[PDB]
Ligand binder design. Structure first.
Ligand SMILES: [Ca+2]
Length: 137
C-alpha cells in the first residue's frame, strides 16, 4: 500500500505559519499511521540547510535528503530511489508531493504516486485520501 510520503521543502513546507502548522499536524498524523516520511529537496545542503535538517533531528520527518549531498537531483529516478531507500520502501509504495510539475511527472514516470502542490487545500485532499487519514487537515 501507500506507505511512504516524500515531500519537498522549499515551496511546500516553508510557507505561512498557518500552512506550516497544517503540515505539522498532517505529518504527525501520517507518522502515527506508520507512514514513512522523507523530505527530498533540490538544495545545496550543508550548513545552509540546517533549518531543513532540523526537521529530521526533531522527529517531524524520518529523513531529510538534499541533492547537494546526494549527488543526484529531482527529477532523476535516482533521487526518488534514494528517498524510497531511506525509509526502506519500493518507489511504487511512495507518494511525492512537490510544487514542480516536472518533479511530479518524473516521479509518476518512476512509478511513484504524484501530488502536485500548488495550494495546501487542494493537495491535502489527495494526501489524506491516499493514506486514509481521519479528520480534516
Ligand atoms: Ca520546491
Amino acid at each position: 500500500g501507500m506507505r511512504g510520503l516524500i515531500v519537498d521543502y522549499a515551496g511546500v513546507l516553508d510557507g505561512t505559519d498557518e500552512d506550516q502548522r497544517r503540515w505539522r499536524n498532517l505529518l504527525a498524523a501520517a507518522k502515527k499511521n506508520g507512514v514513512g516520511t522523507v523530505i527530498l529537496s533540490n538544495d545545496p545542503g550543508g550548513l545552509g540547510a540546517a533549518p531543513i535538517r532540523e526537521l529530521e533531528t526533531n522527529g517531524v520527518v524520518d529523513k531529510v535528503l538534499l541533492s547537494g549531498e546526494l549527488g543526484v537531483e529531482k527529477p532523476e529516478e535516482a533521487a526518488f530511489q534514494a528517498a524510497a531507500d531511506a525509509i526502506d520502501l519500493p518507489m511504487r509504495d511512495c507518494v511525492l508531493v512537490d510544487d514542480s510539475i516536472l518533479n511530479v511527472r518524473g516521479a509518476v514516470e518512476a512509478g511513484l504516486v504524484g501530488v502536485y502542490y500548488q495550494q495546501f487545500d487542494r493537495a491535502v485532499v489527495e494526501i489524506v485520501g491516499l493514506f486514509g487519514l481521519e479528520g480534516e487537515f
